[PDB]
Amino acid sequence: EFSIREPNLEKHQKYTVFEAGHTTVRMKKGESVIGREVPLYLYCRTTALSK
Amino acid sequence: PMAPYTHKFLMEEAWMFTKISDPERSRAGEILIDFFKKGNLSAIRPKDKP
Amino acid sequence: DEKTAITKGYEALIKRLGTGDNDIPSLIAKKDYLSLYNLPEVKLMAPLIRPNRKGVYSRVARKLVSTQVTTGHYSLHELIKVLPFTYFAPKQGMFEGRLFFSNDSFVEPGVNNNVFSWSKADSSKIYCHGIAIRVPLVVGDEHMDTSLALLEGFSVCENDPRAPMVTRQDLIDVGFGQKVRLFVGQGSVRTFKRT
Amino acid sequence: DLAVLRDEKTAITKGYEALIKRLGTGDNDIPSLIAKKDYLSLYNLPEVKLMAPLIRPNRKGVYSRVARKLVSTQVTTGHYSLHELIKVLPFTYFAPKQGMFEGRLFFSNDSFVEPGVNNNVFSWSKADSSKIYCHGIAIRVPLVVGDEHMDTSLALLEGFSVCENDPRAPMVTRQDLIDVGFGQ
Amino acid sequence: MEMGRRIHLELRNRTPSDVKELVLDNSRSNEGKLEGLTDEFEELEFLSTINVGLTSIANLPKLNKLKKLELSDNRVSGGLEVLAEKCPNLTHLNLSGNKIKDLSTIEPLKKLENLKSLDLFNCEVTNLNDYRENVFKLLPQLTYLDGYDRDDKEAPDS
């Protein structure tokens, strides 16, 4: 999974996290939509499901 | 210790790419291929140290 | 009520036709659209237009009416739908396909809606708030050409899936003579060609 | 012979190679013009003239105004990003006009370049500042002039060469190599 | 490069007493600590330190004529009280991209009576509930936040 929020060791105990370069957010600027770069993170995790 | 995250997905802590939808390509494989073609996901290259 | 005000404004716009000179069809046949932007009924309906986006909606409506009238291809329904907004100074801005009214409601060009709905094979019956209104005239082809009432500087063309989907923002950059598929409503995709 | 892409992306890639081919030393070239703050000359270089037809003619003026503006800001202050300059110089051929800038600089082939964010059509990274990825094709940039990120002793090594010994010329530090004049 | 050489380069024989602007972007600073700055810089009115692996503010000298600062892309956290003594005449500040967790770290900025605009983007604090309002109630003198005033009034260019 993707995220833009650094992790907490206590909460994210089942997830392994990486730093996959950078992404870009996009927001209003009056009449035009601009973008600003930010770092991106990668939430790996192995889990089980069933029918 | 505190109870850790459990749900399969990540509520709130998710960043979502986005692309305009197509009714002729409304499937998982087609959507993933289309997202890959623009080269965003391909650019992702995770670093060794976690 | 605001809805009833809009209804009476639209009734006045419809009656203005009057099958006579100094009315909508005579100015149409004359191709003098500027006068349409100064009628009394639009002046009466103007206060019902949201102030913040008044300039942008005036701009878009003015462009649409001008483009349609210039070609002689038009459709009375979309015209009357968008006319009220062209009584102000057009100001640059961002349009998102919804000409919001002062009451928080909306009228989006080229899609039927409760506030104003036009059904094919029912040109005489103009459904406003689920109320049928007879038109004072008769038409069988003056309305059939709506290819120019959807967007501002484009025209419909034959369907083509190969063309890539696009959105309102990117339209400014599309090169000349390039087809562009894009939604015209809910799950309704229509190709367009700049012109 | 070992290629599957069409004439369009190949033409754009060739144009960018040609633009990077004028980054070499000597007068009448990009680095020397930047040193002389003569940004105006960049707009009449032969390779931009050759690459101009591709630019989307409908809005060529608006793009030209934005890219012609950015270079000046980069050129005048002395803080510039060589890669952005190369990316946006093809648009500086035509006369400026008036219009709204959405954010992307299109070509005639529905392929754009956004000024600042790496994309498939043109990519690079601050780690390896000696590669340009045009449609997944690696274009080596010569190392004739440093940039704010890439700046170091290495980024100039290619520019220099050995010559016949002359004892009159001065003896300088390694760091001062950045400041020496071309053809000195 | 390095803040020392970068600065010595920007200073083309100019004394460090007649400049009105300075830039140090895309450099590196040992220990994430400033190095080479002093009180000699008096006429300075602008500063920009971006992506230099910075983490704290301890070697910052006293700068009075300073009226604008930028610390983006670094990992600063905690030190925000020096501003009330070194740059009391400061008006514009920006911290997007740094490590900021709670509001207690922000409270000292109340003493900057000359403060007008602040920019907080991509920080952990931003992920809270009713944060714009709580900050505004903390710093009343403030009017602009991240380029937007109360009621989402976009600020002008400059």
Swiss-Prot record, chain B:
Subcellular compartments: Host cytoplasm; Host nucleus
PTM field: Phosphorylated on serines and threonines by host kinases, including human casein kinase II.
Similarity comment text for this entry: Belongs to the influenza viruses PA family.
Subunit and partners: Influenza RNA polymerase is composed of three subunits: PB1, PB2 and PA. Interacts (via C-terminus) with PB1 (via N-terminus).
Biological role: Plays an essential role in viral RNA transcription and replication by forming the heterotrimeric polymerase complex together with PB1 and PB2 subunits. The complex transcribes viral mRNAs by using a unique mechanism called cap-snatching. It consists in the hijacking and cleavage of host capped pre-mRNAs. These short capped RNAs are then used as primers for viral mRNAs. The PB2 subunit is responsible for the binding of the 5' cap of cellular pre-mRNAs which are subsequently cleaved after 10-13 nucleotides by the PA subunit that carries the endonuclease activity.
Name of the protein: Polymerase acidic protein
Organism: Influenza C virus (strain C/Johannesburg/1/1966)
From Swiss-Prot, chain C:
Record bears the keyword Manganese: no
GO biological process: 7-methylguanosine mRNA capping; cap snatching; DNA-templated transcription; symbiont-mediated suppression of host gene expression; symbiont-mediated suppression of host mRNA transcription via inhibition of RNA polymerase II activity; viral RNA genome replication
GO molecular function, one term: RNA-directed RNA polymerase activity
Primary subcellular site in the record, as a coarse category: virion
Keyword Cell membrane: no
Example of a GO cellular component annotation carried by this entry: virion component
Subcellular location: Virion; Host nucleus
Extent of the signal sequence: none
Keywords: Cap snatching, Eukaryotic host gene expression shutoff by virus, Eukaryotic host transcription shutoff by virus, Host gene expression shutoff by virus, Host nucleus, Host-virus interaction, Inhibition of host RNA polymerase II by virus, mRNA capping, mRNA processing, Viral transcription, Virion
Source organism superkingdom: Viruses
Protein task: Plays an essential role in transcription initiation and cap-stealing mechanism, in which cellular capped pre-mRNAs are used to generate primers for viral transcription. Recognizes and binds a wide range of cap structures of target pre-RNAs which are subsequently cleaved after 10-13 nucleotides by the viral protein PA. Plays a role in the initiation of the viral genome replication and modulates the activity of the ribonucleoprotein (RNP) complex.
Family per record: Belongs to the influenza viruses PB2 family.
Protein name per UniProt: Polymerase basic protein 2
Lineage: Viruses, Riboviria, Orthornavirae, Negarnaviricota, Polyploviricotina
UniProtKB/Swiss-Prot annotation, chain D:
Membrane-spanning parts: none
Compartments, as annotated in UniProt: Virion; Host nucleus
Recorded family membership: Belongs to the influenza viruses PB2 family.
Assembly, per entry: Influenza RNA polymerase is composed of three subunits: PB1, PB2 and PA. Interacts (via N-terminus) with PB1 (via C-terminus). Interacts with nucleoprotein NP (via N-terminus). Interacts with host ANP32A (via C-terminus); this interaction promotes viral RNA synthesis.
Function: Plays an essential role in transcription initiation and cap-stealing mechanism, in which cellular capped pre-mRNAs are used to generate primers for viral transcription. Recognizes and binds a wide range of cap structures of target pre-RNAs which are subsequently cleaved after 10-13 nucleotides by the viral protein PA. Plays a role in the initiation of the viral genome replication and modulates the activity of the ribonucleoprotein (RNP) complex.
Protein name: Polymerase basic protein 2
Entire-sequence positions represented here: 553 to 736 of 774
Swiss-Prot record, chain E:
Keyword list, A-Z: Cytoplasm, Endoplasmic reticulum, Host-virus interaction, Leucine-rich repeat, Nucleus, Phosphoprotein, Repeat, Repressor, Transcription, Transcription regulation
UniProt KW Cytoplasm keyword: yes
Cellular component annotations (GO), alphabetically ordered: cytoplasm; endoplasmic reticulum; nucleoplasm; nucleus; perinuclear region of cytoplasm
Post-translational modifications reported in the UniProt record: Phosphorylated on serine residues, at least in part by casein kinase 2/CK2.
Descriptive protein name: Acidic leucine-rich nuclear phosphoprotein 32 family member A
Phosphoserine modification, residue list: 17, 158
Record's subcellular location: Nucleus; Cytoplasm; Endoplasmic reticulum
Compositional bias annotation for Basic and acidic residues: 147-156
Sample GO molecular function, one term: histone binding
Domain LRRCT, residue spans: 123-158
GO BP: intracellular signal transduction; nucleocytoplasmic transport; regulation of apoptotic process
Subunit architecture: Component of the SET complex, composed of at least ANP32A, APEX1, HMGB2, NME1, SET and TREX1. Directly interacts with SET. Interacts with ATXN1/SCA1. Interacts with MAP1B. Interacts with ELAVL1. Part of the INHAT (inhibitor of histone acetyltransferases) complex. Interacts with E4F1.
Source species, domain of life: Eukaryota
